[PDB]
C-alpha cells in the first residue's frame, strides 16, 4: 500500500526547472546557458535535500515555442567540456559535446545524461573546502546546457522561450536527512534566517 | 514496411510518461556502483523513525529549546498538562515532524500514529500521570474523572521512565490525547521540584500514503 | 562495570552501543596502508560544563582530531584517509541532578553563516580540540549562525532524531556510544580540508539541581578511530 | 530502425476508438476494488425486473 | 446477442463535455477550467444516474483549435492540486500537476486518468451531508483541468476552442437505478420539476 | 404461525423474505468493535394509519433509529459504523379491506427540494420516529418535493420496483420482509449524516371498504439491526 513512498516515485518526476529565452538575431542574449543543478527549484530541491547522497541518471525534455522553419540546437557540455562565449563560438562545433538538433513542429527534444560524477554519489550538502569556498565540490558537477538557433538570421525578430523539464532516473538514495524548516536564501550555499519550529498556539491545551 | 497507424497522443510530452530514452553519451562507462551506508529504498523509513514534538508551542517561545518542553510540577490538578489533536497533517504540533513533514507531501495517508513520553525529570522523583485519548466523535474531557472514564493509561513515573501508545484510525476531527495530574511529583529535599517531559511521535509501522502532491511549506 | 583498554589507554564504562546505519567500519595505481597499531587508542577530549543555560556543542571531525597524538600526526603525512570513530559520552552526573542530552553525528552538516550575505572565515566552524557552543538567540556577523531551534542547518532541531542518535537521560543513564561507519561517496578523502560529520551535544531537557548540588555536570567524549587507513607512501612494484 | 508505411488513418481521431492511452499518473497506486452488492454486468438484467405500466393514462 | 447491453459497451463510448476557448495574449479569460464531473453533459447524466455507485478509469482526448507554431499545456490537477488563479500563476510548474504539451497539426492529445477516488466507488447519488450542503461528498471528486497556450506572446489575437472528449473505461456498476423521470434544472443538485409519468392518451381503450 | 425472539423483544410473524441484492449481512490502524449482545432487538416504530387519501410514507435510515435505545445511543458515541436492517412490515388489516402497497428501500434516495432554486435546511428530509407523508400534488417552499407520481427523487414511481421490493396485497398477504445488506462504497460512515437507505411505502391500490370497517388501516414497521460493528475507542497495541 506504501508502494508510491518509494524513492523513485517520490523522487522521479519531471519538474520545470529552467525558463530561459533567447533572440535569434542581434549578443551574450542569443544563447541560453543553464549550468546543471539541483538547487534551482525550490520546491525539487527540499527534496533532494532529504538525502544527503544520491545517485541517478538525468532525462531532460526542453520545450521551445517561438514569436521560414526554425532549428534549435541544444548543446550539452560534460563538466570537463569547452564553453561557448559566443552564438558564433567554435565550441558549438566540438564533436565531444553532445547536441540535439530539433525543428519546430515536431515532438519535443529529449535527451538522457548518465551519472557523471568522479565520486560514487552526488552530494546534496559538502561540509567542507574546495582548497577556498565553503559548500562546493566538483564531484556533483553535472554539466551545462547551451541553447541556440542554428539559423543564420532571419528577416523578422524570432524570439524563442524554451522550458527544460528536468526527471531523475534510476534513483538511489543514502543517509536520510530531516527537511528543510527555514525558506531558502541563496541558490548557491545553505544560509538561512532561523524561524519558529511550528506556527503558535494559544496555550498548551 | 510494415502498416502502421499513429494514435491519438503521437508526438505530445505527457510530463509523467516513462518512455525510454536516447542517451546522450552511450560510450561513457559510468563510474561503478560502491556500498554507502544508509540505503533509502522508501520513505516510510523516514516517517517511522520517532522525533521530539514541540507540545509546548506557545505563542512566546517557538524559536527556542523550550517548546519541546512539556513543564511539570509547577500545579493546580483541574487542568490539564497538555492536550493536542493527533492528526499530523493540519495540526500545529505534530505538523512538522519527521513524520508530519513526510505526511504533508500524501494527499490521502491511514495508519496509527505512536507516542512515546519521556520523563526528564530527576530519578529520586515520583508521582502519576494519567494519559487520556478520546476518539474522534468524543468530547475532550473536562475534569480528571472524566478522562479516566475512558481510554486512559496511569502512568507511574517513579516506577519507569517511558511510557508508549498506538493511537488507531489515524487517517485522512481527530482523537485527542491529553494528560492530567493524577498526582503531584513527589520529590525529597534534594531533588528539584520542577520537571520536563519529552514526547516523541512516530509511525506505528502502517502508514499508507498513496496520492503524492506539493508541500504547503516552501512558497 | 567492565572496562575496556585499547592501545596504551583504558577507559571504565547500560552497555546498548548504536551503529550508525548498522553497519560496522570496514577495510576496502591505488594501495592503501593501514596502522593497526596506535590511531585505535581512546582519546578523550576535555570535558565540558554543562549548566541551566547550556544551549549545546559541536564538534567537527576529523579535524576535532587534530592534535590528537599519531591519529592527527597522520593526517599531515597522508593525503587521503579514512576512518570509524567510536565515540563514548559519558555524562557522570549525580542522582539529584535532572537533564536530557540528546547526543548525535549529522553527517555532512553543512552549517550557515549568520550575515547570510557573506560567509564565515573557515574557523567559526571548526576549533580543534575545544567545542564550538550554539546560542539561545539569533546571532550576527561572519561566524556560523549557532542558534539552536535550528542547529545551524536550518532544519528542525526536534526532528534531528533521524541521525545515528543516543539519548542521554540523567535519570535513567550517563553514557553513550556511537559507531559511525566512515559515511563518504568518495572511498578516500582529504581529512584537513573535508568533514566526515559533526558530533554535536543538544540538550533538550535543561539542568536542574538544589542549591547545594555542584553547579554544572562536566560531559566528557571518547573518540577512538577504528580501522584507520591511508594511502600507500611507497612506490608500487 | 526498421522501416514503416503509415496507413490513411494515421494521426485521426476516431471518436469510438479502443487504443491503449498513455496514463497520467502510473506511479498512483489505486484503492483496491470492494464487494459491493448489485453488481451491474448486463442492461437486460435492469429491463428484466417487472414494474407498474401506467395503462390508465388518460387525459385527467 | 445482447453482447452490447454491457455496461462498457452502454457506459464507455467518448462525448464532447466541454466546449470553451481561452485567448493567447490580453485575464482569467486566458485559460480554461473545467472541474470533472459526470453532471455536464445532459446525456451522459442520465445514463450516469441508472447506477449508485460506478468505478472506472477515465480516458480524455482534447481537441485544440485556433483562429507562429502554437503549443497548448493541459495540465490535470489531482484532487489536492493547486489551481492556478492566473495565466502566469507558479501552479502551472507544479512537479505533481502531469500536464501534456501538444503542438498544433500533430494527433490530439490523450491523457488517462485511474480511479482516483478515497474510498470504493464513485456516487451518482449521496443522500446525506458534508458537515453543511447536501448531496455533495468529496468522495467523487476528479480534478480540474486547466489549459493554455505555453506561447509568452503572439503578435496577432490568437483564440483558441478546446472540446473534451470523456471516453470511460473498464467500467464497473452496482445497485441499478430507475431512469430519470423528470428533466435537469441545474448541474450540481437533483431538483426537479414534478412531470407526467407517460404521455396522455384519449381513452383507457 | 412461528414466532420469532430477538434479544428482549419478541414479535409474532407468508414466510417470504426477500434479501436485497441477493446478499447477506456480514461482518468485515483500523479496528472495529462489533456489539453482538443488544442492538439486534426489533425496534417496532409507531404504527401509521392508513386511509383513502394516504399517498404514502417515507423513513430514512440509521437516522430513524436515532432515539431507539443502545443502537441509536452507539450512533452518538462511535464515529462509524455499519449495520443489516432486517425490516418487518405488516399491515394488518381486515378480509373486508382492499389495498395494495409497495414496500421498498431505494439505497441513496437523494431528494428535490420544492422551491428548485433552494436548498431545504435539513429536518424536511427526517424526523426520527414519525415518517414523513408524500402529498398528493405539487408543494412549494423548502420543504421536499413530496409529491407521489415522482417519490420525490425525480424518476417514475411506477418503475421504483428495481430496489430491493415487496408487495403488500391485503387480499393475498399483510407481511413483508426485507433485508438490507449495506449498501455503501466506503466501508463504514458516520451513521449521522449520511443516509444509507430510504424505507418508502406506496399505496398503489388505494385503501377501501364499507361502511361498518375501520376507517383506517395501522401499519407496522420493525426494524432489526443486524451485524452492527462501529470503530474502536480503544487504543491499539
Avoid at chain 2, 34 to 58: F, Q, T, Y
Avoid at chain 3, 17 to 26: A, D
Wanted: hydrophobic residues 35%.
Amino acid at each position: 500500500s506504501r508502494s508510491e513512498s518509494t524513492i523513485e516515485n517520490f523522487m522521479g518526476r519531471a519538474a520545470c526547472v529552467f525558463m530561459d529565452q533567447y533572440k535569434i538575431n542581434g549578443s551574450t542574449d542569443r544563447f541560453a546557458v543553464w549550468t546543471i543543478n539541483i538547487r534551482e527549484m525550490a520546491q525539487l530541491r527540499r527534496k533532494c535535500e532529504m538525502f544527503t547522497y544520491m545517485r541517478f541518471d538525468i532525462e531532460m525534455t526542453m520545450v521551445i515555442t517561438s514569436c521560414p522553419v526554425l532549428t534549435h540546437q541544444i548543446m550539452y557540455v560534460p563538466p570537463g567540456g569547452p564553453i561557448p562565449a559566443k552564438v558564433d563560438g567554435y565550441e558549438w562545433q566540438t564533436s565531444t559535446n553532445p547536441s540535439v538538433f530539433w525543428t519546430e513542429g515536431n515532438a519535443p527534444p529529449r535527451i538522457s545524461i548518465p551519472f557523471i560524477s568522479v565520486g560514487n554519489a552526488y552530494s546534496s550538502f559538502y561540509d567542507g573546502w574546495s582548497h577556498g569556498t565553503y559548500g562546493y565540490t566538483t564531484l556533483n558537477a553535472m554539466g551545462k546546457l547551451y541553447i541556440r538557433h542554428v539559423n543564420r538570421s532571419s528577416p523578422h525578430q524570432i524570439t524563442s522561450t524554451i522550458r527544460v523539464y528536468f526527471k531523475p532516473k534510476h534513483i538511489k538514495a543514502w543517509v536520510p536527512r530531516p527537511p528543510r524548516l527555514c525558506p531558502y536564501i541563496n541558490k548557491r550555499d545553505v544560509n538561512f534566517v532561523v524561524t519558529e519550529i511550528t506556527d503558535s498556539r494559544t496555550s498548551i491545551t | 514496411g510494415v502498416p502502421v497507424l499513429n494514435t491519438p497522443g503521437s508526438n505530445q510530452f505527457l510530463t509523467s510518461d516513462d518512455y525510454q530514452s536516447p542517451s546522450a553519451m552511450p560510450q561513457f562507462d559510468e563510474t561503478p556502483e560502491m556500498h554507502i551506508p544508509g540505503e533509502v529504498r522508501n520513505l516510510m523509513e523516514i516517517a517511522e523513525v520517532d522525533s521530539v514534538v514541540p507540545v509546548n508551542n506557545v505563542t512566546g517561545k517557538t524559536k527556542s529549546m523550550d517548546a519541546y518542553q512539556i513543564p511539570v510540577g509547577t500545579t493546580d490538578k483541574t487542568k490539564p498538562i497538555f492536550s493536542f489533536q493527533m492528526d499530523p497533517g493540519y495540526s500545529s504540533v505534530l505538523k512538522r515532524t519527521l513524520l508530519g513533514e513526510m505526511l504533508n507531501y500524501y494527499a490521502h495517508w491511514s495508519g496509527s500514529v505512536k507516542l512515546t513520553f519521556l520523563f526528564c525529570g530527576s530519578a529520586m522523583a515520583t508521582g502519576k500521570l494519567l494519559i487520556s485519548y478520546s476518539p474522534p466523535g468524543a468530547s475532550v474531557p473536562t475534569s480528571r474523572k472524566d478522562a479516566m472514564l475512558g481510554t486512559h493509561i496511569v502512568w507511574d513515573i517513579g516506577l519507569q521512565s517511558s511510557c508508549v501508545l498506538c493511537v488507531p484510525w489515524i487517517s485522512q476531527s481527530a482523537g485527542y490525547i491529553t494528560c492530567w495530574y493524577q498526582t503531584n511529583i513527589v520529590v525529597p529535599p534534594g531533588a528539584p521540584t520542577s520537571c520536563d517531559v519529552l514526547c516523541f511521535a512516530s509511525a506505528c509501522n502502517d502508514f499508507s500514503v498513496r496520492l503524492l502532491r506539493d508541500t504547503p511549506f516552501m512558497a | 562495570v567492565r572496562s575496556m583498554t585499547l592501545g596504551n589507554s583504558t577507559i571504565t564504562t547500560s552497555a546498548n552501543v548504536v551503529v550508525g546505519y548498522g553497519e560496522w567500519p570496514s577495510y576496502l595505481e591505488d594501495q592503501p596502508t593501514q596502522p593497526d597499531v596506535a590511531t585505535c587508542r581512546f582519546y578523550t577530549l576535555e570535558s565540558v560544563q554543562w549548566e541551566k543555560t547550556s544551549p549545546g556543542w559541536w564538534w567537527k571531525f576529523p579535524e576535532a582530531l587534530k592534535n590528537m597524538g599519531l591519529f592527527g600526526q597522520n593526517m599531515h603525512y597522508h593525503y587521503l584517509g579514512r576512518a570509524g570513530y567510536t565515540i563514548h559520552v559519558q555524562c557522570n552526573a549525580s542522582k539529584f541532578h535532572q537533564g536530557c542530552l540528546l547526543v548525535v553525528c549529522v553527517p555532512e552538516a553543512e552549517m550557515g553563516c549568520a550575515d547570510t550575505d557573506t560567509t564565515f572565515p573557515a574557523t567559526e566552524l571548526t576549533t580543534e580540540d575545544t567545542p564550538h557552543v550554539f546560542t539561545s538567540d539569533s546571532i550576527t556577523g561572519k561566524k556560523v549562525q549557532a542558534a539552536v531551534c535550528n542547529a545551524g542547518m536550518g532544519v528542525g532541531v526536534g526532528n534531528l532524531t533521524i541521525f545515528p542518535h543516543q539519548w542521554i537521560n540523567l535519570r535513567t543513564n550517563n553514557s553513550a556510544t556511537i559507531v559511525i561507519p566512515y559515511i563518504n561517496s568518495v572511498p578516500m578523502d582529504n581529512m584537513f580540508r573535508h568533514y566526515n560529520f559533526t558530533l554535536m551535544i543538544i540538550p533538550f531537557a535543561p539542568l536542574n539541581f538544589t542549591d547545594g548540588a555542584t553547579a554544572y555536570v562536566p560531559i566528557t567524549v571518547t573518540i577512538a578511530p577504528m580501522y584507520a587507513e591511508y594511502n600507500g607512501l611507497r612506490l608500487a612494484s
